[PDB]
Write a protein that binds this ligand. Structure first.
Ligand SMILES: *[C@@H]1O[C@H](CO)[C@@H](O[C@@H]2O[C@H](CO)[C@@H](O[C@@H]3O[C@H](CO)[C@@H](O)[C@H](O)[C@@H]3O)[C@H](O)[C@H]2NC(C)=O)[C@H](O)[C@H]1NC(C)=O
Ligand SMILES: *[C@@H]1O[C@H](CO)[C@@H](O[C@@H]2O[C@H](CO)[C@@H](O)[C@H](O)[C@H]2NC(C)=O)[C@H](O)[C@H]1NC(C)=O
Ligand SMILES: *[C@@H]1O[C@H](CO)[C@@H](O[C@@H]2O[C@H](CO)[C@@H](O)[C@H](O)[C@H]2NC(C)=O)[C@H](O)[C@H]1NC(C)=O
Ligand SMILES: *[C@@H]1O[C@H](CO)[C@@H](O)[C@H](O)[C@H]1NC(C)=O
Ligand SMILES: *[C@@H]1O[C@H](CO)[C@@H](O)[C@H](O)[C@H]1NC(C)=O
Ligand SMILES: *[C@@H]1O[C@H](CO)[C@@H](O)[C@H](O)[C@H]1NC(C)=O
Lengths: 173, 49, 106, 173, 173
């Protein structure tokens, strides 16, 4: 939520993208297509799995304790045993509630972060050869086939190659 | 009168999550803490003219 | 000619200082107190059933000190013992007084 | 603080904006004016009300417990009751201290975030028709009356309408 | 990590920068040089010292408690004393682990944040006179001596002085 991409300037997600968490949809003179971006996707997963690594399968061994159920009324000593237990249960129950709320806020936010970073990296790569349409898409002001499109995705796009062409188109009258 | 939370000092409203009135309580009560005040921001940082 | 467009946010003349993770005193636009720090000085009789012990301890009402005869067979959610309470019957003790008092209270 | 808008590139807040938390001040050929932005303001308020919902009116019922004041010295059993109580109180006192500091950092930061988003959304809307002066304000390189200004605020500004006009002004010699 | 500057578009840190945490490296017709930025460095330091202030030298006094070691087997009363202590120990131990993980996450991110802000501030100052090469560096499209570079760092750079020059260079064919 906090970076404002996911559920923000990105209107919604793409249900037809089943091979990654983040990616690219393009349109050009040969048609329109889609490809997942591996690095951003993996980055998000690694952080979530890190949370999982701290939380899953990490239980503490406890052995002989105090009794916690009682068949006879006894008073003072029984009051104390039960209260200790009730007190313990409430604090652990508290930590867990807080933990989940906190982990969940940070997870929506970290995923929002990864989408935005991918946007920014892409934004920067195109230099003066593209403009931000405001909804996560870029208008590319030059002919850009799949190989061209592939180069952006592959991080090998050479902005200098297209610049004259792109500039003429942007700044036409 | 009508109040969910009773302490030896008297009944207290139970809207707040915490209280420093008395460690002794009965009913739907805020949890006792040592602080006399804990202020939760309900607005952005203030940067006056 | 043209135009200028500025983005901004509000502020107030009477901000309140709160503590955060990185600074113990930062001014914000508004805040709320999370610690109840006062009582009205009385125990409300609703919605819980209050029983005022007056001159009688729980144990004395139990045993049946004559001045506690009014307490016979009554129920309570919260029994309130007054510091002014006193026994006025045959002098007694209760081994583990606190437990008996407790089990009856509960 | 963490996004760097509020108490950052936004030099300060506007005390005269009392009908919203975020908004626009403009200057043009017909004058200068101010209007709150409802959507960003509501976004900030909603998250803060969400925190309050977890915190306000949510107390736990407790009934018979242990005694916590004592008129006679007793030793072993009384030390434990007192120790149990002090321990509980200290832990609850910790969570509360930790809760508020954490909530407050997150609240300042999320509000900073919403201001920046509004800046970002607005920045994107204007395309090549405006430049960022660096202090949260944009210089718009064309005549832009109230209807024009209203359109930016209203999210209906058509960058294409003014582009020729704006570009000539930006890239003059 | 979350803003994507540190360990992100900034390929790495500079070990040779020993007089600040953030700063500038430049190259021009008179050479290439380095200067720390004092304000951003201090901003980061100030936030970290604040955490330390909450944590360092702030211990709680405790006096007479319960016994915690025992030379004889006693059963019920002894089980409870031990259980009370173990329970206490486990909860304090939890808060600390969580505290450090949380504090550490926020510190890397806040430091990432400060780096990004300095970049963003710098980006705005240069207006249309520079382009983002995508790795935290700007290509400046005009002659820029030490005095020129110094002016950017010092926040007194006048984009109007160089704008005509820069535009001719940027928008060449
Ligand atoms: C600064 O912020 C506080 C808190 O956001 C504002 O306090 C608001 O005051 C009203 C009236 O007391 C509260 O209404 C009450 O709500 C509780 C539970 O929600 C309900 O049980 C009561 O019957 C009553 O209606 C309200 O909760 C509270 N705002 C919120 C959202 O918590 C205060 O107005 C602000 N101060 C200024 C000057 O802006
Ligand atoms: C609620 O009652 C308690 C108990 O009477 C009050 O605690 C006393 O506070 C005074 C003032 O500092 C101390 O001198 C006494 O030692 C305390 N008494 C005991 C037995 O702890 C407390 O002040 C009351 N709370 C409020 C908010 O009125
Ligand atoms: C509880 O017992 C006390 C003590 O005996 C009573 O206090 C007396 O009240 C009467 C009537 O006002 C006075 O005339 C006496 O001076 C009081 N005696 C003492 C020793 O103080 C009190 O009435 C009883 N309380 C209740 C509610 O039954
Ligand atoms: C990236 O582009 C290069 C240049 O064509 C190509 O050879 C290579 O297959 C691409 N790399 C990946 C991993 O897609
Ligand atoms: C947005 O545009 C519509 C269509 O002209 C207009 O009726 C409405 O008043 C505008 N909204 C605001 C609040 O300016
Ligand atoms: C910033 O530039 C101004 C104008 O020359 C000068 O007065 C000041 O000394 C400079 N600041 C630093 C620290 O270089």
């Amino acid at each position: 939520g906090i970076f404002g991409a996911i559920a923000g300037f990105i209107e919604n997600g793409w249900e037809g993208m089943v091979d990654g968490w983040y990616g690219f949809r393009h349109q050009n003179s040969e048609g329109r297509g889609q490809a997942a971006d591996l690095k951003s996707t993996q980055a998000a997963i690694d952080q979530i799995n890190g949370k999982l690594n701290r939380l899953i399968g990490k239980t503490n061994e406890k052995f002989h304790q105090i009794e916690k159920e009682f068949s006879e009324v006894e008073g003072r000593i029984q009051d104390l045993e039960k209260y200790v237990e009730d007190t313990k249960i409430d604090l652990w129950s508290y930590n867990a509630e807080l933990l989940v709320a906190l982990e969940n806020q940070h997870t929506i936010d970290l995923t929002d972060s990864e989408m935005n970073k991918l946007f920014e990296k892409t934004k920067k790569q195109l230099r003066e050869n593209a403009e931000d349409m405001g909804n996560g898409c870029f208008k590319i002001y030059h002919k850009c086939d799949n190989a061209c499109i592939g180069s952006i995705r592959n991080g090998t796009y050479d902005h200098d190659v297209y610049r004259d062409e792109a500039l003429n188109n942007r700044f036409q009258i | 009168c009508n109040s969910e939370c009773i302490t030896p000092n008297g009944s207290i409203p139970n809207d707040k999550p915490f209280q420093n009135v008395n460690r002794i309580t009965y009913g739907a009560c805020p949890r006792y803490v040592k602080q006399s005040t804990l202020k939760l921001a309900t607005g952005m940082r203030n940067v006056p003219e | 000619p043209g135009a200028t467009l500025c983005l901004g946010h509000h502020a107030v003349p009477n901000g309140t200082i709160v503590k955060t993770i990185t600074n113990d005193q930062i001014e914000v636009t508004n805040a709320t107190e999370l610690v109840q720090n006062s009582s009205i000085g009385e125990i409300c009789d609703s919605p819980h059933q209050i029983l005022d012990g007056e001159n009688c301890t729980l144990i004395d009402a139990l045993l049946g000190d004559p001045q506690c005869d009014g307490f016979q067979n009554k129920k309570w959610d919260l029994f309130v013992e007054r510091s002014k309470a006193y026994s006025n019957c045959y002098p007694y003790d209760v081994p583990d007084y606190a437990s008996l008092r407790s089990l009856v209270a509960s």
